[model samples]
Target: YQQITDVVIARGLSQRGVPFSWAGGGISGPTRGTGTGINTVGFDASGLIQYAYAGAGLKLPRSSGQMYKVGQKVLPQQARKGDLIFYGPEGTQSVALYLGKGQMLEVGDVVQVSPVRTNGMTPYLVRVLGPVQPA
Candidate 1:
């Protein structure tokens, strides 16, 4: 799921140019320069989902990891499209959208599509926030 979601979010970010804070997660904000920043704002985890959906011609909410609580957990191999994969530190300060390709799209210091491999990430450990499909 990490690879799939990464493709979705990265495609969205690539085409939509990210979003602005307080602006809708996957669509054009008020105006190009109406906000303080440019990068896709508010995308954390849920935003990435929204961005992908919007890019695919669907509309979704702009919420972040909070959206994960809406679904049930399944084994990693059983994960399917639209199912969200979540990861974080001790108490969820950070989260990423798993694309199932062993990579994820997350925002920490900046927005990027990254790998989910367990061995190379230095102090951070991968935690499954589980998976959720579009309902």
Candidate 2:
């Protein structure tokens, strides 16, 4: 099957070094967020992800919680490069784009790659672009 994995990853990287904003970023792109992020131009966890997927012509709802509703859950072993890894119940906490190989694209104050951790991770992962891959 055809998967826009490369395109998605490229788009995700485009936000690298971008400051993190609480609610900043959408299909159109990153913008100044609300609250403490009101004056900062950057992207948050979900914002960066939505923008990346949008680049590949895919639409994802905003926010970590609502976005969780867009796809079905898969086990960690079933997660692929484009899958979304979520934290907290119903994914109300934060979200990251799976980059495979124990690394994920996430945002705390800026878009960057970090080692995958399981302390707060949910039991399953969300697959949006496509199914898991052989690698």
Candidate 3:
């Protein structure tokens, strides 16, 4: 678990400072500028998650809503490194990766590390990469 967490952190941090673009990433990685009004070339919340987890050999869905439904529900107090932290309103949710010690990596405008804010956020544990669990 520690090793996987380490890899997830390392890979996620590697993407630090990348730009943020809605629907701008795919299976291979961040795609070229799609000019989606924002006019940037980078990752959305879920796309960033997909890229980071892919570095650790796990593939995730392209949308935050889809990714949110695939993992195990985890309480805020129990969230650990590598867990997916989701937030936002009911219809439009955002997801980030927990990096332990009250820090989370997310793509909002850009890839960055920020303090975990659970005021309106939900946490999820993705154990699929390490073990098979009923989804």
Candidate 4:
């Protein structure tokens, strides 16, 4: 159900303020970082998405690039709560959960809510659980 989006967002909110652990976080939750992130503890872009969707009783790819291929593509105007918003390049990109009102939940320097398009980078929206209201 679309209400499942709430779970996804809830999970994202739950982890707010956590460090952006490289290779940190998974289906279960945040783990230690690896490589440059080896010292911090938090979720990477994809890891946070994976952790959130898992809370919604869904499974997502381990990486955002792979995940970009998982759902229906939609225009920026069509973006709604629970939508996956991608930024940066295709294969080595960044991702965030669309929380509507032009806001997103992502793990950057830390897990936090952000404007959907603050970086001037083109943003693509994906609908896995579908927007809050059907389009």
Question: Model 1, 29-109: lDDT tens per residue?
Answer: 222321543442454344555656554455553443344444454545654444455554321333455555576655543
List the RMSD of every prediction in angstroms: 7.2, 3.0, 3.2, 2.9
**TM-score of predicted structure 4:** 0.87
Q: Which digits, one per residue and each the tens of the lDDT, describe model 4 over residues 103-135?
A: 888887889997766564435678886325342
Candidate 3, residue 57: the lDDT equals 77
Overall lDDT per candidate, in order of appearance: 0.46, 0.83, 0.73, 0.79
- Candidate 2: the clashing residue pairs are 20-109
lDDT of 3 by residue, 1-135 (tens): 688778777987888888888676644667654567257768877777887788777777776777767666666666678888887553147888888899999887788999988777853444434543333
Give the C-alpha miss distance for residue 121 in model 2, angstroms: 0.3
After superposition, the stretches of candidate 3 with alpha carbons farther than 4 Å from their true spots are 33-39, 89-92, 123-128, 131-135
What TM-score do all the candidates reach, one by one? 0.49, 0.90, 0.82, 0.87
Local error of candidate 2 at 24, Å?
0.5
Worst 10 contiguous positions by lDDT, candidate 3: 126-135
CA deviation > 4 Å runs, candidate 4: 118-123, 130-135
Q: Judged by lDDT relative to the true structure, which candidate is superior, 2 or 3?
A: 2
Global CA lDDT computed for model 3: 0.73
Tell me how many clashing residue pairs each candidate has.
15, 1, 0, 0
Model 4 residue 51 CA deviation in Å: 0.5
